[PDB]
């Protein structure tokens, strides 16, 4: 995993969205947040500055998988062109007309499943169900309906905020088909989606998140050789005396 900070915030949704095949970042004063990703990734995949409707809050404004990328109505034609030019033709990019414009809060996704706010349907959202990617589910994380903020996800595991119940966790891991766990971020934060971005090979979060939280993240996401999620078997009582 990795910890770093730009301007001085532990919340990474202020700056970035990250998948298996591209990484979006916000344009800032300095190229240090971009360099933090370039260090671990190199030139292997697209690393792309730009704003969304002249805003930096791009992981919370956007959402996508390795197959594509959804952006809102407030997005300009130039930023859209810029993303199109800077990304390959393998990722289909689309501008969506919706009341709920924060797609990275309204949606949590991986390359095989997606959860959504229970609110309005659409023609091409009911078409995206199987067109663009695959399953959509209208669900709710312990009453928190802002799934992309209150839950982080990948293809190998999932994290939710700590007030989620065992019952709801088992119900939601059935839909996602992969293990879930409830945890906190950045010295006791329930908001995991903004505080962290993660995928099949790499994790980035803030400087303030503790070593137990990092160990859980590493466990549930399969980073270190080897951590198949019952390394919690080893670190049982660490979390006990921590919480």
């Amino acid at each position: 995993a990795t910890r770093t900070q730009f301007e001085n915030s532990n919340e990474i949704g202020v700056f970035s969205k990250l998948t298996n095949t591209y990484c979006l970042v916000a344009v800032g004063g300095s190229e240090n947040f971009y360099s933090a990703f370039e260090a671990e990734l190199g030139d292997a995949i697209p690393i792309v500055h730009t704003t969304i409707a002249g805003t930096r809050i791009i992981g919370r404004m956007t959402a996508g998988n390795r197959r594509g990328l959804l952006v809102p109505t407030q997005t300009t034609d130039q930023e859209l062109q810029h993303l199109r030019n800077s990304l390959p033709d393998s990722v289909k990019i689309q501008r969506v007309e919706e009341r709920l414009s924060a797609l990275g809060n309204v949606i949590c996704c991986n390359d095989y499943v997606a959860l959504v706010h229970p609110d309005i349907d659409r023609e091409t959202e009911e078409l995206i169900s199987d067109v663009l990617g695959v399953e959509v589910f209208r669900q709710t994380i312990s009453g928190n309906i802002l799934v992309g903020s209150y839950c982080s996800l990948s293809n190998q595991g999932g994290l939710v905020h700590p007030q989620t119940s065992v019952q709801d966790q088992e119900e939601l891991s059935s839909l996602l088909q992969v293990p879930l766990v409830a945890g906190t971020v950045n010295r006791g934060s329930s908001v995991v989606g903004a505080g962290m971005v993660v995928n099949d090979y790499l994790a980035v979060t803030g400087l303030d998140t503790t070593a137990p939280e990092l160990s859980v993240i590493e466990s549930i996401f399969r980073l270190q050789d080897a951590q198949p999620e019952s390394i919690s078997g080893n670190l049982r009582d660490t979390l006990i005396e921590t919480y």
């Binding site: 240090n32 370039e38 390359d111 839909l175």
Partner: protein, 424 residues
């Protein structure tokens, strides 16, 4: 709690007097005249008395509230600060300052007297009288403030110890090695010269084991001392061993070194084993038959564990450290995560998509000559953070590269190009 450092400076009596009286002479006006109204004169001297009172009580309140209550804190800190500062003297000085905070009585009485002043001379003499009585009260505070400034400097430099955290004591005879055990195991500025009471205080270090903060405590020394006479340096060690919920590591140093004999070492151990009744003890030998009988001596105690090791090797150190941590965490959890799973809902396969690029890729060594440039450094080359104009282009993917520095028209006569722009 934990670093009573935010205590404002406690000035001596004469300096405090000079401060509070010069503040009055400076801030409040200084000029009145006989031809002025008696009400003006009264208000003048009243303002002076009231400001002078308020200054003294502000100062004294900063002392009283900033200083800790030696009772009402924790028994460990209480006993430590008692053996350091003499609790009786401490409380007596602070009570002296509280009762002096008298000044209020003088100010109120003399203001209420000033209400009836019928002349400038009368009002002036009443003002002088109030300030002089204040000065007498403060002059009678010469020794407590001298005591309290010293206690302030000391208690600011004391270390922040949580008694409830995972702790381990490091005990033994003087000149053993238990302090450079702390030096080696943990970051800590401690002296290791070869004589008895090289350290006169408790020193703290931290480390992380199993994703948990621990604190190790080096304690200066204990002697065999039949215990109705002992000094304030050893009573620190005793109170620390008695109060805290730690493991405890007795260093024996089986050797002619130490300037102390093995009989005396086991004697001290048997002397202070009543403190060990609930403390998770371990013994470490840092490299004849009676000397060995003296070791099964201590093994025969019910809860104990012996180890042989060194400061010569640096792995047995971590060994025994982890042993002490494991011994503690067990009956911590005694004295005191659920991952979900799918249950087989479908056959659709899912798998990690990763390109070959990252597996062929090389990590980033920040201290290699030949490496990746990483635009941080391109910034450093061209110009700093706020001057370097990055090209958002130069990354883009096109059919022709010669057209890098092109622009798309956005608007024509009335229309917008993006609306008419299709491939077909």
């Amino acid at each position: 709690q934990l670093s009573w450092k935010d205590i404002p400076t406690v000035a001596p009596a004469n300096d405090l007097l000079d401060i509070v009286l010069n503040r009055t002479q400076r801030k409040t006006p200084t000029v009145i005249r006989p031809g002025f109204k008696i009400t003006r004169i009264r208000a003048f001297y009243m303002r002076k008395v009231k400001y002078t009172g308020e200054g003294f009580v502000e100062k004294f309140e900063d002392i009283l509230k900033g200083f800790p209550n030696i009772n009402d804190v924790h028994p460990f800190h209480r006993d430590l600060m008692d053996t350091l500062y003499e609790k009786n003297h401490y409380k007596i000085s602070l009570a002296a300052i509280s009762r002096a905070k008298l000044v209020e009585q003088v100010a109120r009485d003399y203001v209420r007297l000033l209400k009836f002043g019928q002349s400038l001379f009368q009002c002036k003499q009443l003002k002088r009288a109030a300030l002089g009585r204040m000065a007498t009260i403060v002059k009678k505070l010469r020794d407590p403030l001298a005591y309290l400034e010293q206690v302030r400097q000391h208690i600011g430099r004391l270390p922040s110890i949580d008694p409830n955290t995972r702790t381990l004591l490091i005990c033994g005879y003087p000149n053993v090695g238990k302090s450079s055990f702390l030096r080696c195991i943990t970051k800590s500025d401690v002296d290791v010269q070869p004589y008895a009471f090289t350290t006169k205080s408790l020193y703290v270090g931290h480390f992380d084991y199993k994703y948990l903060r621990f604190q190790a405590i080096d304690t200066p020394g204990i002697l065999d001392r039949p215990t109705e006479e002992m000094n304030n340096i050893e009573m620190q060690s005793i109170y620390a061993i008695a109060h805290l919920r730690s493991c405890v590591l007795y260093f024996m140093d089986l050797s002619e070194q130490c300037g102390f004999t093995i009989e005396a070492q086991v004697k001290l151990f048997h002397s202070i084993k009543p403190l060990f009744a609930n403390k998770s003890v371990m013994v470490v030998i840092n490299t004849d038959e009676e000397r060995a009988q003296l070791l099964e001596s201590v093994k025969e105690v019910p809860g104990v564990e012996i180890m042989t090791s060194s400061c010569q090797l640096e792995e047995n150190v971590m060994e025994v450290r982890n042993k002490a941590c494991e011994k503690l965490l067990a009956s911590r959890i005694e004295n005191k995560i659920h991952v979900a799973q799918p249950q087989a809902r479908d056959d659709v396969k899912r798998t990690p998509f990763i390109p070959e690029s990252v597996k062929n890729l090389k990590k980033y060594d920040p201290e290699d000559p030949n490496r990746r440039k990483l635009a941080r450094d391109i910034e450093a080359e061209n110009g700093g953070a706020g001057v370097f104009n990055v090209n958002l282009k130069d990354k883009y993917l096109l059919e022709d590269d010669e057209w890098k520095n092109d622009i798309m028209p956005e608007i024509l006569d009335g229309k917008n190009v993006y609306d008419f722009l299709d491939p077909e």
